[PDB]
Symmetry: C2
Subunit: 348 residues, 2 copies
């Protein structure tokens, strides 16, 4: 598809690279650093490369109006959820240290100006912008000014809307990814629209492309690798019996390992060209292709015809099935036995 | 992608239809009708819709030269394998009756003129042509003359080669499918080249597109659904401990059920357009989009600026984050409290 690439720390990302799975722990820790550490342990032990957090500073993120609005996958106000779930600066700094102490890359999604400045103080190697802030052009400008790569979710937004965000990003001169995304928790298969990935890469030829996913399993993400996706994001939990509005669409260690294995196969299998000559197929061609044979006894001097000629495996005859019709009307130079391959010396 | 369709018996096939999995029992029965019936039972009980056989009449299929050539996935001559494995006319007619007695569609691949005439006598509803006969234009002409749809594998052949086959097919006026395929047993992931499917549909806009597969698992086939594949073919066996050169790349009842479930999800998830407005996302937009707020106390009469304005969730303010800059320079009509959403009545 393309050769766009950039680095998140030491990890190269892009079409010619192994797909990257982002383990979005998000608010799954329910505000408990202990729980967050257990989930980081589970992610490390499953082989995860990247852990993503969400950086919530409720006062800079929401006006009082947020205390009256309820999200789709919850039964209380968004302000209550974020107040209950948010880690303070001290705890989030400990979370970054812990993730990196396990050899993994820590990134996070800022939901406010204050969160973005905190992540800059911590010097994270790349920024995620959630689909809710895809059209928050003031916030994107700030984050782009940090000089780090940006991974931008694009749910709830048109290509025309996304263009303004990409413009801001290009102007700051940082590389970026676009994650196709549908922000319904959970997302029904029929609303995934994997074709949206092609729409994004077609509109934005310099973007790394991936999928942020909220379905109940790995199928959408595996199809996105098949379509050329380079970054896959699903929520992550150490076990499925945890409480939380995002747990149910999360992967756990087992299903993370499956996605990793599926994505590696699909990275290998994807792309390429129909007409590529595959050396491993040569033995098969040699026995499976047909050659021209006599369909009857043909006397010396008789004319070769569609009536005394046919074609049979294997493919080592002097004349291939491709040349069948070119023998019509040639003259038998010898007697020719029924069933014999037609030889170059069988015709004048 | 497209709206091409045709019918195999009562089963509609094509991009707007459920993907069809062809259970290729092939020569997996090792010449035993009993074994073939056990494998048909296993396919029925797993929910299979179509069972494919291979119709081998060794004398019409191979000249004596085939007694000296060995295939890649075997250790004796192709002639010996086919002689040992082939069902005679009486047994194959029983196989078709049995498949249809379980409510399934029976099709088969002819490897010779004689095999094609036998399948015509049995009146099968569609013909498969294997990748070895993709360039057997005499055989394709015969099969196309039968008036039934054709499902053509395209391994070992260029687009330019396939064009001659499609020309013959179009001339007889039967609908057809093209299965991308790599004829290595088993096929390494890296040789699948799923992009070959796009090459085929681009060159042949009227074709139904699918994949014939010989890898060790379902990943290639699942990626082919994601890419728009309508027909998926893998070898099938009732259990993996059977003998046979094709067993090891076969599905069994369990892995057939997985492919069926994956393909149904990917059929739902695939295609579509980025800019489609998704009703289920509306609640999320309402709380996640930002509105313009006062970043400071602003006295009556003061000018609105980038310095006393910012943006915060949720999205029910009078001014969206989109209109942030249009408020610059407006005049405060009332005193405005820090943190308050900017109201239409807050500006002259």
């Amino acid at each position: 598809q393309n050769n766009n690439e950039f680095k998140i720390g030491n990890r190269s990302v892009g079409y010619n690279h192994e797909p990257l799975i982002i383990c979005e722990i998000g608010i799954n820790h329910e505000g408990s650093l202990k729980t967050a550490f257990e989930m980081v342990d589970a992610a490390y032990n499953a082989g995860a490369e990247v852990v993503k957090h969400q950086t919530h500073i409720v006062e800079d993120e929401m006006s009082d109006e947020a205390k009256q609005v309820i999200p789709g996958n919850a039964d209380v106000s968004i302000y209550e959820i974020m107040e209950r779930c948010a880690l303070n600066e001290e705890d989030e700094i400990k979370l970054k240290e812990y993730v990196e102490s396990k050899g993994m890359i820590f990134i996070s999604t800022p939901f406010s100006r204050a969160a973005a400045l905190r992540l800059q103080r911590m010097d994270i190697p790349a920024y995620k912008i959630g689909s809710g802030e895809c059209n928050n052009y003031p916030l994107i400008k700030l984050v782009a000014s940090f000089g780090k790569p940006i991974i931008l979710s694009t749910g709830m937004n048109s290509i025309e809307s996304i263009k303004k965000s990409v413009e801001i990003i290009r102007e700051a001169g940082v590389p970026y990814a676009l994650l196709h995304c549908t922000n319904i928790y959970p997302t029904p298969y029929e609303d995934v629209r994997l074709g949206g990935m092609n729409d994004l890469s077609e509109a934005f030829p310099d973007a790394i492309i991936g999928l942020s996913d909220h379905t109940l399993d790995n199928y959408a993400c595996l199809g996105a690798v098949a379509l050329g996706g380079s970054i896959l994001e699903r929520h992550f939990t150490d076990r499925m019996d945890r409480p939380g509005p995002d747990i149910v669409c999360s992967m756990n260690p087992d299903t993370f390992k499956e996605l990793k294995q599926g994505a590696h196969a699909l990275k290998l299998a994807r792309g390429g060209k129909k007409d590529t000559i595959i050396a491993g197929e040569k033995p098969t061609k040699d026995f499976a292709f047909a050659s021209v044979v006599a369909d009857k006894d043909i006397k010396k001097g008789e004319l070769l015809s569609g009536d005394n000629l046919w074609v049979k495996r294997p493919g080592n005859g002097d004349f291939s099935v491709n040349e069948y019709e070119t023998l019509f009307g040639k003259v038998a130079a010898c007697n020719i036995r029924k069933g014999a391959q037609i030889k170059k010396t069988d015709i004048e």
